[PDB]
Amino acid sequence: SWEVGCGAPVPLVKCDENSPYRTITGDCNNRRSPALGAANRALARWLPAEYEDGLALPFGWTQRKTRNGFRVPLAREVSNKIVGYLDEDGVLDQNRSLLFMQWGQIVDHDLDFAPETELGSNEHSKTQCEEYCIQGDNCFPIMFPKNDPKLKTQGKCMPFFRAGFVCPTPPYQSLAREQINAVTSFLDASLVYGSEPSLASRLQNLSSPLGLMAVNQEAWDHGLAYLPFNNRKPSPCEFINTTARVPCFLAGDFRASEQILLATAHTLLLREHNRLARELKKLNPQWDGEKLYQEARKILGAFVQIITFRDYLPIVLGSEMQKWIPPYQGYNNSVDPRISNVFTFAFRFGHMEVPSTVSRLDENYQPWGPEAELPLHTLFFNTWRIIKDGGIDPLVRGLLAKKSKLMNQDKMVTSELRNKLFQPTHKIHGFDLAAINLQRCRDHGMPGYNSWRGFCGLSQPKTLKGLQTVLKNKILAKKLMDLYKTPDNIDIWIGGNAEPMVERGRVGPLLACLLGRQFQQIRDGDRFWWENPGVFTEKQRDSLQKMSFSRLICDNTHITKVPLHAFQANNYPHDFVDCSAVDKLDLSPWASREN
Ligand code: HEM
Ligand SMILES: *[C@@H]1O[C@H](CO)[C@@H](O[C@@H]2O[C@H](CO)[C@@H](O[C@H]3O[C@H](CO)[C@@H](O)[C@H](O)[C@@H]3O)[C@H](O)[C@H]2NC(C)=O)[C@H](O)[C@H]1NC(C)=O
Ligand SMILES: *[C@@H]1O[C@H](CO)[C@@H](O[C@@H]2O[C@H](CO)[C@@H](O[C@H]3O[C@H](CO)[C@@H](O)[C@H](O)[C@@H]3O)[C@H](O)[C@H]2NC(C)=O)[C@H](O)[C@H]1NC(C)=O
Ligand SMILES: *[C@@H]1O[C@H](CO)[C@@H](O[C@@H]2O[C@H](CO)[C@@H](O)[C@H](O)[C@H]2NC(C)=O)[C@H](O)[C@H]1NC(C)=O
Ligand SMILES: *[C@@H]1O[C@H](CO)[C@@H](O[C@@H]2O[C@H](CO)[C@@H](O)[C@H](O)[C@H]2NC(C)=O)[C@H](O)[C@H]1NC(C)=O
Numbered sequence: 001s002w003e004v005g006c007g008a009p010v011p012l013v014k015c016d017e018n019s020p021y022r023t024i025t026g027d028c029n030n031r032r033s034p035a036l037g038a039a040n041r042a043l044a045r046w047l048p049a050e051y052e053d054g055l056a057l058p059f060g061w062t063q064r065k066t067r068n069g070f071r072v073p074l075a076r077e078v079s080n081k082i083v084g085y086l087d088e089d090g091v092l093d094q095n096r097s098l099l100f101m102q103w104g105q106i107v108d109h110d111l112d113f114a115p116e117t118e119l120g121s122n123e124h125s126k127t128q129c130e131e132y133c134i135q136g137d138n139c140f141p142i143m144f145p146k147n148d149p150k151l152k153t154q155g156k157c158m159p160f161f162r163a164g165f166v167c168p169t170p171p172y173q174s175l176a177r178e179q180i181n182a183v184t185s186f187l188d189a190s191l192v193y194g195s196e197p198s199l200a201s202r203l204q205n206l207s208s209p210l211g212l213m214a215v216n217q218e219a220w221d222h223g224l225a226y227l228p229f230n231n232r233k234p235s236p237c238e239f240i241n242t243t244a245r246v247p248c249f250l251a252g253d254f255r256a257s258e259q260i261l262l263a264t265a266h267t268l269l270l271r272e273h274n275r276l277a278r279e280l281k282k283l284n285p286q287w288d289g290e291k292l293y294q295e296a297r298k299i300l301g302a303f304v305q306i307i308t309f310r311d312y313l314p315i316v317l318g319s320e321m322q323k324w325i326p327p328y329q330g331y332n333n334s335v336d337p338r339i340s341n342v343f344t345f346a347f348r349f350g351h352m353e354v355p356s357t358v359s360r361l362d363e364n365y366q367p368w369g370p371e372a373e374l375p376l377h378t379l380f381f382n383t384w385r386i387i388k389d390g391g392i393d394p395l396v397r398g399l400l401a402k403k404s405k406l407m408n409q410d411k412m413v414t415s416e417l418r419n420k421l422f423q424p425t426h427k428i429h430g431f432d433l434a435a436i437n438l439q440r441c442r443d444h445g446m447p448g449y450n451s452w453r454g455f456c457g458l459s460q461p462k463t464l465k466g467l468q469t470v471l472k473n474k475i476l477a478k479k480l481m482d483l484y485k486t487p488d489n490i491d492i493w494i495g496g497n498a499e500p501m502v503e504r505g506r507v508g509p510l511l512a513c514l515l516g517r518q519f520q521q522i523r524d525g526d527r528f529w530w531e532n533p534g535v536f537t538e539k540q541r542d543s544l545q546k547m548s549f550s551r552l553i554c555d556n557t558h559i560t561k562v563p564l565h566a567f568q569a570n571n572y573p574h575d576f577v578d579c580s581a582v583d584k585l586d587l588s589p590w591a592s593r594e595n
């Protein structure tokens with residue numbers, strides 16, 4: 001008895017069987033268990049959920065119920081005390097480009113999305129929550145502590161709505177509350193193509209048999225494409241500058257316009273698909289609209305996989321890479337490919353990697369204009385700066401020439417995210433990503449820090465002094481202990497990120513284990529992994545290994561001067577070579593001799 005059945009409210013169809021292409025929803029990857037890894041199903045639970053009432057209510061909800069004998073500290077107070085800092089000087093990662101951060105967010109968005117609860121196409125709930133901070137039903141407000149500046153100017157709380165959950169919607173019961181993953185668990189470029197058949201089609205250009213994705217018709221970038229605008233009104237990207245009135249972009253994933261540099265990455269990817277389809281039609285004139293689409297799509301998925309596993313992961317995991325992701329040995333049908341609930345919090349390490357400004361660079365990589373460098377907070381949901389202020393190139397050069405923020409125990413998340421975050425629903429630039437992440441841990445029913453330490457076979461400190469040794473920091477450990485009273489209560493997000501970094505990596509031991517495990521699984525459990533014998537031909541594989549993020553830029557923008565290794569810190573002009581010197585993807589193994 002597993003309650004095993006609930007496969008209700010989720011989209012279902014029938015398995016093409018022997019079809020050489022992924023489904024849009026991720027169904028039919030695993031043959032014996034077709035829904036494994038599919039969009040719109042519960043996040044997997046590596047450990048049982050820990051809720052206040054065993055079942056659904058998050059810790060902190062009832063002001064008199066403790067966690068292990070103690071009150072859990074307010075999310076925003078953990079924010080003020082531990083996460084914040086004032087001095088941006090000295091914070092840059094000396095050996096990671098701004099693209100390091102940016103790629104993490106692309107990968108993250110391909111793997112997981114736990115959307116908020118609605119129950120309001122119009123309702124006094126999406127206003128009884130913001131207006132009066134009344135806790136109730138899915139309103140779980142972030143209360144301001146005594147002495148928080150935002151009291152004086154903003155109000156009593158920050159509104160926060162609980163994440164969606166499987167089986168039904170309305171008030172629910174029985175089992176413990178399981179959050180939804182609205183995206184496919186496979187590294188499959190679902191952020192470009194969509195996770196629903198509904199959206200996947202909208203995204204496509206079905207006016208012509210060329211297998212192209214829809215492109216914006218109102219605006220161009222030197223004869224290069226943009227993403228289509230979104231139908232949706234109200235539009236937050238419009239609300240950001242009512243004079244300019246530029247809507248958000250329409251991509252395979254809904255978060256695409258969250259910040260300008262993410263919209264930039266999205267548009268590079270769309271551009272690549274269309275390029276692939278054209279080139280492909282040249283070699284194979286007989287091919288379908290659909291065949292063009294799927295074949296370009298499959299190449300792109302292979303790209304996202306290769307860069308992620310070859311270029312990106314080795315420099316997050318560092319020396320722990322070998323211990324968690326051993327060399328590939330083939331598809332294993334017994335490996336569970338689903339994204340775990342804790343992964344969506346472990347992968348939030350990238351929040352501590354966001355710097356406070358974004359730069360635009362000209363063709364010599366010099367400050368583009370008099371306002372080249374901008375505070376990150378003016379760029380949330382900002383599309384007008386792309387369309388009406390130089391297009392994509394000045395913004396991509398910044399990604400190569402500037403650095404990520406480095407995680408630092410005394411300087412965690414920049415005030416740009418910690419004080420001035422803009423939420424697409426509400427109206428001010430006054431939210432706090434750090435406090436939200438913490439509130440969300442509780443919302444998702446996360447075991448505490450020592451549960452995960454235990455899970456990863458690592459020591460579980462019980463005392464101040466134990467915590468000082470693990471964190472290798474007396475002061476940090478003291479603050480944590482004063483807010484939390486015992487390490488068993490430390491929220492996973494703040495606990496995992498407070499750990500010193502492993503050698504040659506950018507996360508600590510606990511994070512390396514959680515991430516490493518997840519990635520091993522999503523590679524080993526993927527029937528369509530690129531190296532899986534029979535998915536691509538040997539000659540096709542040889543062609544795919546030559547792919548690089550540098551090339552992507554050469555083929556898709558008017559940048560002519562790029563680094564070879566784009567994720568490490570690169571200085572212009574020494575570290576920058578001409579595009580000619582950069583290996584090209586050879587599409588000739590994709591030829592199809594008729595007779
Ligand atoms: C300026 C850059 C970024 C902004 C503004 C941003 C903003 C946000 C916001 C508002 C959320 C939702 C919080 C919640 O409701 O719980 C979120 C979630 C998340 N973020 Fe970030 N983020 C950024 C960069 C990154 C980076 C660099 C990474 C990783 C390298 C990352 C990983 C994640 C992940 C994994 C989630 C959970 C998504 C889910 O499963 O629902 N983000 N981010
Ligand atoms: C800045 O970061 C660089 C990013 O990797 C780093 O250089 C790299 O160092 C690692 C080992 O420390 C090596 O990487 C690779 O190792 C072998 C080559 O012997 C390959 O077979 C592996 O697949 C893997 O890619 C490289 O030697 C080197 N990687 C690159 C891309 O050049 C620098 O050391 C960092 N700078 C400093 C001083 O911290
Ligand atoms: C809202 O978005 C507006 C862009 O649609 C933006 O206004 C634009 O920005 C500057 C003025 O600050 C102008 O840029 C330059 O234009 C000419 C060159 O042709 C110069 O002579 C000007 O002096 C100026 O430097 C844009 O022309 C201007 N466009 C319009 C129609 O106003 C606003 O800054 C945005 N506001 C916010 C709050 O972000
Ligand atoms: C769908 O694809 C078609 C075919 O490329 C696009 O229409 C072309 O647009 C360019 C620029 O205007 C012109 O060469 C022609 O007007 C069209 N070509 C042909 C073959 O007629 C169209 O823009 C795409 N539709 C969308 C919404 O992206
Ligand atoms: C595929 O991965 C599965 C899941 O981890 C492996 O299942 C294991 O089977 C081995 C023996 O082959 C046992 O030693 C492990 O204890 C099993 N794991 C669990 C917890 O079930 C399996 O090793 C892999 N299959 C192959 C043949 O590579």
Ligand SMILES: O=C(NO)c1ccccc1O
Pocket residue numbers: 105108255258
């Ligand atoms: O940018 C985001 N994540 O990185 C994001 C933005 C809005 C809503 C949910 C999200 O996950």
Ligand SMILES: [Ca+2]
Pocket residue numbers: 110111183184185186187188189190191
């Ligand atoms: Ca996916």
